[PDB]
Amino acid sequence: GWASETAALSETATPQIDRITIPLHELAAMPKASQRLLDDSAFDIETW
Amino acid sequence: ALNSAVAAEGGYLVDPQTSETIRGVLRSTASLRQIASVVNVEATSFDVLVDKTDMGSGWASETAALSETATPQIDRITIPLHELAAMPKASQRLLDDSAFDIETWLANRIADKFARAEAAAFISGDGVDKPTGFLTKTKVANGAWAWGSLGYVATGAAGDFAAVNASDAVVDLVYALGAEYRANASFVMNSKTAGAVRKMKDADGRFLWAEPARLMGYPVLIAEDMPDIAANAYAIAFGDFGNGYTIAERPDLRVLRDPFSAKPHVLFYASKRVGGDVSDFAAIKLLKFAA
Amino acid sequence: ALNSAVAAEGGYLVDPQTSETIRGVLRSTASLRQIASVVNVEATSFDVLVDKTDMGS
């Protein structure tokens, strides 16, 4: 603030630091493919 | 564009020209420093060494077996060299926007106050944290004069000078001082004592005493810190302060500006340190008004 | 030597600056001279000779 010609000029204020956390979770998927329908199938399911 | 008197019709184009230097009341400077013994000393104290006595001469015979003669005993006097400090507070917004030189004026106005505050200590100051003036030196009647004391001559009447033979207490004070100290000696009075001296007039109304304002031919230092003519006061002193009084000082003024204590101000802290008391007690006589 | 706020203190010796040149409100300079015909005439008056009509054929 404007100090003015005469004043004590006390301590004003300081930005209060706040911390935001990005917990970094994981994204998972487990397609359960049978073994039969994996080698007797003409389509490559393991790459599909 | 018209007359410079009325404001709107061209009166705003004037700008009063201010002073060159910021003047001030010209206060007393007769400080006894210019007549006493000022010695630069960068220490905690000054220790003078005097010879309170003298030797003995023989006038030896042709066959006399010369004996040992006297030898002057020696006195040491310690000038404590106290300090004098003043701390004026000037705003920082002022110092910036103040076309004069406020710092140089503050140091020049302080050095005027110090040269004036130490003039009181050299005359009537006591011993605590300040030089002892020659008035606090156990004044003893003259004739019964010892070394550790200042002599004085009495006037007669208590309130003022003698009732009948006035102006004899002044002349015998002169000739009670020693022909070698009177060579360069001077009275010390205040403004209202030197006035009461000039008002002294003979039996016909004419002044009996005939810019430096000397008295009986000897100079007069018009102090402002000696006592005036009271019931039992020492209003007039006279002596060779060139040898009687010694001043010890550091010939500078240490100013420490402090922008930190008072934050929007600067708070100049200046302090020179000076001390001094009488070193030759035989060289200062006094005029007590008691009896 | 105190603050420059009250008069009988540092407040007397401040002396504001004064805007080295005196300015004024700005007025338009378009004067019809940059379209009209300006003729330097050192006389009591100027005449012009025109042809209010034309010839015949």
Side-chain angles (χ1 to χ4, degrees), chain A residues 5-6, chain C residues 3-4:
Chain A
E5 224 306 345
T6 311
Chain C
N3 48 195
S4 69

Side-chain angles (χ1 to χ4, degrees), chain B residues 61-87:
Chain B
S61 173
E62 189 76 32
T63 47
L66 279 149
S67 48
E68 302 131 8
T69 42
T71 299
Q73 62 190 359
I74 294 164
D75 195 355
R76 158 179 281 191
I77 298 157
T78 70
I79 308 288
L81 185 40
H82 316 270
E83 72 151 48
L84 178 55
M87 192 165 59

Side-chain angles (χ1 to χ4, degrees), chain B residues 13, chain C residues 18-24:
Chain B
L13 280 41
Chain C
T18 39
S19 157
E20 59 177 359
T21 185
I22 170 171
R23 59 176 64 91

Side-chain angles (χ1 to χ4, degrees), chain B residues 31-33 35-39 48 79 118-126 130-137 150 239-248 274-281 283-284:
Chain B
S31 176
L32 185 141
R33 180 195 169 200
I35 63 172
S37 275
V38 179
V39 58
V48 302
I79 308 288
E118 76 193 29
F122 293 161
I123 290 178
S124 159
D126 76 79
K130 76 179 75 60
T132 83
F134 60 87
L135 296 176
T136 64
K137 301 300 298 200
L150 268 65
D240 185 0
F241 299 94
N243 302 318
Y245 205 92
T246 314
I247 303 171
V274 63
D277 76 356
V278 299
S279 64
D280 190 347
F281 289 66
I284 305 174

Side-chain angles (χ1 to χ4, degrees), chain B residues 15 18 89-91 94 97-98 100 105-106, chain C residues 1-4 10-11 13-15 18 22:
Chain B
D15 285 318
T18 58
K89 173 168 71 177
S91 159
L94 172 77
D97 312 335
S98 159
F100 298 107
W105 172 68
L106 279 190
Chain C
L2 257 283
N3 48 195
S4 69
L13 41 85
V14 285
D15 286 329
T18 39
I22 170 171

